[model samples]
Target: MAYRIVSETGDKITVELTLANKNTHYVWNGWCFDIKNITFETTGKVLSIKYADGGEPVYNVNGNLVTIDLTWRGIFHLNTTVKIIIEIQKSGDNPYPHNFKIHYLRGESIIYPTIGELPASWKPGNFTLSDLIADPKSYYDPHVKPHQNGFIMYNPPHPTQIIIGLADIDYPLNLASSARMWVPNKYFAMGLALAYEWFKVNPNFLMALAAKENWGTAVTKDPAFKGYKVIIDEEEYYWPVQIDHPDGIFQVESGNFNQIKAYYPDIFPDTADHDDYMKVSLDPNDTAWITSPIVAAVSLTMERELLYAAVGDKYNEFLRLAKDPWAETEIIDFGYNRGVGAIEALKIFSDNWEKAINAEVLWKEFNMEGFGGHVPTVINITATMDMETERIYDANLTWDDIEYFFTVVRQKFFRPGAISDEEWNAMMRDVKRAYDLLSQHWGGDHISYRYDFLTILRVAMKHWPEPHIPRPTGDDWYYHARNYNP
Candidate 1:
């Protein structure tokens, strides 16, 4: 419940808002003196006030609209409410002041606020009690159906005819949905890095999720997946010696070309596509190898501030384990084969992992699956050149990949003398090229793959234009969840 102040003397006043849900508050721009004797009186209770940092709060007494930075015992939990009648006395001020007009100012809080602009473009914090009880599937689309094992599946028989199960139990069940969810995973990771680099906010929650997901993959093995248990000379190993799906579990066969070809005609038809089949069969994990380590690297580089306060030294241990490939297997992929528009995410960000990976391996892995004038390969090859510098040569790349390397990636982020340029012309050219390539692969048949591919491209474009969207601002979970963009 909300409460207002009653004053006796006549004077104008501004009652700055108090964020009940958060641990910190920012005073108005003008207040300069120390506040004392702050009190909140209600029908059944009274609370003495102090600053969040444990000192007497700072206040200005122009009138009676009392504002105090009261340190609290706990955060405002869900389904809880409190009422307060605030009164404050600034240092060297008379006690008889009153006639206060109350004005509320915006403030950050642990609980999301419903004021001004939010971090992401979408509306958040709208969850109700009904949402808790509603079937998770109810929120999903009607076209997709659940399999016997509660796995969500999307099967079709047209432009891209194949069946694939949901990767995870998260809200958005698939890659496309993940992009359109509250925030994209990659964006969240990037925001964590920004917060660590500039905003001083901790990367606790971000690191927690990545570590948990990747760790879960190592511990849990899907029995349905072929080769989950390898038998050699009649001896058996329950879990495969290698591979981890950081995103989620997958269901694909291993080493049965005839079975794969018959089962997924769209996924595997030609002999060239069979190579992709062989790779997935031998190494069928998603992009977790790159993403997971990146998460760990960002965590390690993050300042020990709020993150340390939340999780303590245990976080450093998690970061150490996550960054090691021996502890967590390396798994990365971008697109599909000739059958479907197999454009997966195919770009690298940051220089944290240069020492951990080999440029030759990246060159080979990045050039795997693509179609459309090999546009996917072109974009990734350019990205690899930027990632590995002169080490990634034209001889190792396709002619188009080499041509677009200068036109796309290098022209955008590269600059002479280590200087930063906006690369506006290159960006527009690539954006147009991206749009044209994406337009060809539009519609329901290509929804998941195209959406996943576009998100990476959009992120690459965002960075080249000088990191406008994920600016380091806001100090709440919503900010991170929405990738600090609004």
Candidate 2:
């Protein structure tokens, strides 16, 4: 649904476009909206693409044609109502009071990928639905296949609509997919969707958590990786949500790992109660811990519940404000990065039991795989940094941590000396880095979390950076079963 309103006061015209789709749609990177054939009372030139909606969409008024690129962001789910209002201005030596006419307004699509790195060239959104039906296995997506439907009934039906998108995933599913650097494979996407659905958590919350823990792992894949090497019982291991379990803590043999259960009856069918995700992720000796992001998925869910338990209302309060994607990254990651049960973790960090742990220890001493955001990291540069909560919990605080804390963290909410506040500024930089890193890791996870009111404004920016895509669950084959009734 769309319409135009020409300003009566000036040579301004506004086009309001209301877009809603019944079927799942991808707002691919490089997509654009073209408004062309403009004449300002036959006396002016097409001028600016700037609008007062507080948007900075990349656009150019080439002659009479204006092109607006959605490339400011990555992938976005287009299942909800998206309203775009463009105030196109015409300028010249003799500006007219009469509004100019817009002959055509339409969109263009050039698809890249949803996850991993970009390809040599952008591919189409996918093989057309027809292409999938003809050769389902070649481009098969367990997620997409179930939603496969006949095109005859699809809304605004077209032949080239994308169905299977795996070929577009440049990252390999095995070693390259689950690590912090390369980010998600189809499996991780699958796990993320299921984790958010089952836990009823704001999806954005889950994404930021994953990002805080893993860089989207093209860079690293060792799930057991604890950050550097540490030996428990004379055995060594690697590092995050880097990890909460110390050595011998969540190791498959430790039996404590089993407590963090990941049961997706669809993904890991016939999996029993005692079954942990390790069934597929662990080696026979339990020494090789190749954590499928699926495991990382469940850990964060449980970890979130644990944080809520520890912080009680404080978590909910932040949870309330964190409905926005940006705030979610900072608020949730803030809590996740700043520890609530930190003293316990720090007490263990440099103590007798501490020597056994490398990074975040989840009070595993009590057989609990939990991190209560007790450790406030410096721009998340390190998962486990020594710092105090300020004014309190100073027992384990180091001189450097205290120096930085008193100098910066303490004056954060208020600019005491008005001295350079790097901590507060660093939070924005931290998130921007996440947003700009690849624009694919949950879009640096800015598009994932939300509540009702918070959810409404989650994607507040008219122009935004891209977020990653996920494989949703349900009678997900619902897509296959439905018909678009015009």
Candidate 3:
């Protein structure tokens, strides 16, 4: 088949040219020659065009016998070079292996100016391959977003533990400030857990964070404040709002129990009697986004506690508390007073974690306004709570399962040249060693305390085996560079 226009964006066009003819008149519109002659020459696939007194032609594509349509358009610039790289498919038994070039020239040119040689920056600590294999010890007193006042633990002794403390609430009403605070150091537990699983790391430490069900509460001086804060023992503390701090602080937030209670008073009446209020920083109209996380967390905690309570009596007290004063609200319904809310609440808070996990149903619902109107949708709380407890509790996996898991990891994320097969194999071997060590030491206890195994599993699989995915040369290209088939 002849070459076709794969796609185009304005002047830049990707033409899949055929190698039927050794070279042909490839013509296009748009070139301006202002002050000098713009000459073109082809040396294999490299298209070199010279304008002004100096210029180099850039090129792309494959096949023998490539030709250009030198039918000049209006005013081709002598100083500017408009380079085009097109993909050409050869029509023969032996296919062309690489791209050819076109060398165009304007005049005899002088050497291009060169800058000074830059020296490498100083590094203070010892670095070795062994150091790379081991967990890194690094620290930085970074300015967190939404506010500049607080600090976070980086690469703590426990490695997975995240701690945040509030020294002062300088401007509680500066929801704008709270809106910008963030901690970059506090990420990776969920991701790290997954990596541990894929690498077959020790069960003792892997996925511990997900299993640790702990939520701290705090209130601003004003209970109505909507910004997130670092809360400890029911006190308003330093904070950031919803991760996206306009000021560059990011990655973590402290939840305000009072604000959550105030925002969803009926649903969160446990702390409604307190004097503190919340200063909500997000747009007033966005209720769904604001209340989703709060309800989801509470719901997830309830699921875990309920699951544990089903087989034992440890969570009986929590179950008692969850049932007594639960309420319904515009945002969330712990009491499940909306439609099938009571059913959903009971389903999640009972021994039916399996049913709850599989309970999402696609409904033919009606929407009053829209182009096509009433839309069909699937709704469920599985995505909302993510049901990490069920996943971790049920994951009695062995080394045999890792083959399929690794295959999926490669399918989803392995880009060409990102990681070699040998590197991947070595990493897996290390993980297996860790797994054996954990199994020998901790054994069955490892299974119980493991948190969000799915989260860790998926994340771990995604983390490594990434690096050399080809960079895109086009505005809308993905995964590979131009002319790259894979």
Candidate 4:
């Protein structure tokens, strides 16, 4: 048979190139390399052959063509298949491998596989907010496919909260970008749909927030986009958000699980402090990727509670308008890229909302006053605030225009410095796509607002093509990578 490519990472880190001899007649037990070498198109020139699956077989790379050794052809080495992996650091722009032509003479040959780093669920599209709200877990079955399985929703003990879970693997693994839609992030999309039932945050709005954050550890080559581990009295723990950088331009002090969880233990209850709700009804069985968004939402909810407590009736009013979609997500993101400022930003937005709503200005744009105050919140450092929400509303909005809303919001939010404008835009599209695609199938007429959320998560996850092997990966891969047999 002709050689074939099993899977190839977009940037050259992981790939499984398989080949065999076309002939079927060989030694009794197996056959050997009867052929020449392997060649294909790639993102760039192969820098060097790194590592393979089992043993290091004889091979050479002169430019793009790979040559093989015939040492194993004798009957003493008779075997059906041989496992070899040739990973590389590519030198051009084609981060992936493709277009294979295998040449051979032996009757038959075998190619062994290797390990590669990479990276949802829910239901048939018929699922509704009512079904999800009442019990999101009922939608899953071990026998069926994880319905686009990117998003996973959990109802923690907190009476008012339901958290979103995704496959939160580190960068370089397939769960690396915000644009990925297929697996981990699809689980996220399903969960976002579920969140509409149990949580107030809008999925589209939440999607924009995730886009600005660039969602995963892999989006940038910047080492800063990656994460770190913590050491406290000999106990080690991975930082909650994989990219443990400074909270960013809008947020200075903190947004880690410990920081937000410290304020609301009820929302994120595990003491060592990563697992939320002790895995209550957690279907995917992964705490890392799931935990990241859970913590982010906890901060969002914590802010809602705190701001609600401070702004009183107006806060209630703000939540009223916000509970629907778009506004709160963008405004709060304004606070943290900026949300720490959102408290007053909330007040100013309140000023905008009250002034505009009272006049029934159709709840469109705003130009309010700015103020300086030593805000009184747990991490409150002093800073003056300005009141303004851009394009808060424009023309008649329908489900069709979410693309505009998400697209417009990203212009002002903070983003990872290394991410290109093109990739970022693609991510937002996938996020909207994740929401819309699922809605195309699962969404209902009864519920008007909900968004698909996953890789670009800003989540499409196409860059590092996730391996297509059969063993346990995805959520289970987290354990597999660390050698913990799940």
Of the candidates shown, which would achieve the greatest TM-score relative to the real structure?
Answer: 4
What TM-score quantifies how close candidate 4 is to the native fold?
A: 0.29
The local lDDT score (0 to 100) that residue 49 gets in candidate 4 is: 42
Off by over 4 Å in 3: 1-222, 226-230, 233-426, 432-469, 473-486
Model 4, 22-65: lDDT tens per residue? 33543211222323344555555554442244445466666655
Candidate 1 whole-model C-alpha lDDT, 0 to 1 = 0.26
Q: Which stretches of candidate 4 lie over 4 Å from their true place?
A: 1-196, 215-256, 274-286, 316-326, 349-486
Point out the worst 10-residue segment of candidate 4 by lDDT.
378-387
Ranking by lDDT: 4, 2, 3, 1
The global C-alpha lDDT for each of the candidates, from Candidate 1 onward, is 0.26, 0.29, 0.27, 0.33
Output the lDDT of residue 256, model 2: 25
In the order shown, the candidates' Cα RMSDs to the true structure are 23.0, 24.9, 24.9, 26.1
Mind giving the per-residue lDDT tens digits that candidate 1 earns over 395-428?
1112243234324223322223222445454444
Candidate 2: lDDT over CA atoms? Answer: 0.29
Alpha carbon lDDT of residue 442, candidate 3? 37
- Model 4 lDDT, full chain set: 0.33
**lDDT (10s digit) by residue, model 3, range 59-115:** 332334443432232123223334333532333443332333322221122111121
lDDT of 2 by residue, 367-402 (tens): 332343311221222111111111110012122322
After aligning candidate 3 to the native by TM-score, how far in Å is the CA of 40 from where it should be? 9.0
